């Protein structure tokens, strides 16, 4: 079993890289409201097969570049 995250592809232009947003809900520490927060991750893909809008499952791996420490596991709903 491998820990994994799910998010959406906000940019796929880079060669073999993509940026994914793993937006999440979090209770506000003071005011109790549940707020959306987003975390952008540079993720590694081979073949640059992930298109923008795709929902993708990613995993954490060794450093692959100055800013990439996550890799793609698989695409969910590749329709866009």
């Amino acid at each position: 079993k491998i820990r994994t995250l799910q998010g959406r592809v906000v940019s796929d232009k880079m060669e073999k890289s993509i940026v994914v947003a793993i937006e999440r809900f979090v209770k506000h520490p003071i005011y109790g409201k549940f707020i959306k927060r987003t975390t952008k991750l540079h993720v590694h893909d081979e073949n640059n097969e992930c298109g923008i809008g795709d929902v993708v499952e990613i995993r954490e791996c060794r450093p692959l570049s100055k800013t990439k420490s996550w890799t793609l596991v698989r695409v969910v709903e590749k329709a866009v």
């Binding site: 506000h28 003071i30 005011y31 109790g32 409201k33 707020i35």
Partner: protein, 122 residues
């Protein structure tokens, strides 16, 4: 009012403004007497109040009260000042501490001796 609003611009407490800036969080400060004079009080009351101008070790120059009946102070006297307004005397925000370096105690006092630097009478 709305939570959303507070989440965008949190409540922001006002910073308390001090009443004794020349002391800069020091209980007492030392300073030299530049001039010693008397000033008229505010309109409701009436008297000749003893004050001094004081240059502090930190550069600040302030006016300070010289409480008590009688004082032997002149220019180039090094005194100690403490916090404390006089209200009916605008500008004077510090109180000279009797008993300090070149502040003599008030003569012939029996009550409140410790507030005026007066030794215990034999």
């Amino acid at each position: 009012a709305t939570v959303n609003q507070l989440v965008r611009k949190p409540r922001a407490r006002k910073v308390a403004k001090s009443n004794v800036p020349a002391l800069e969080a020091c209980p007492q400060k030392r300073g030299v007497c530049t001039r010693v004079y008397t000033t008229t009080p505010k309109k409701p009351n009436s008297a000749l109040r003893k004050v001094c101008r004081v240059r502090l070790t930190n550069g600040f120059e302030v006016t300070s009260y010289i409480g008590g009946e009688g004082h032997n102070l002149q220019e180039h006297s090094v005194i100690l000042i403490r916090g404390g307004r006089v209200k009916d005397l605008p500008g004077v925000r510090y109180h000279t501490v009797r008993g300090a370096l070149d502040c003599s105690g008030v003569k012939d006092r029996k009550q409140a001796r410790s507030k005026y630097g007066v030794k215990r009478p034999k």
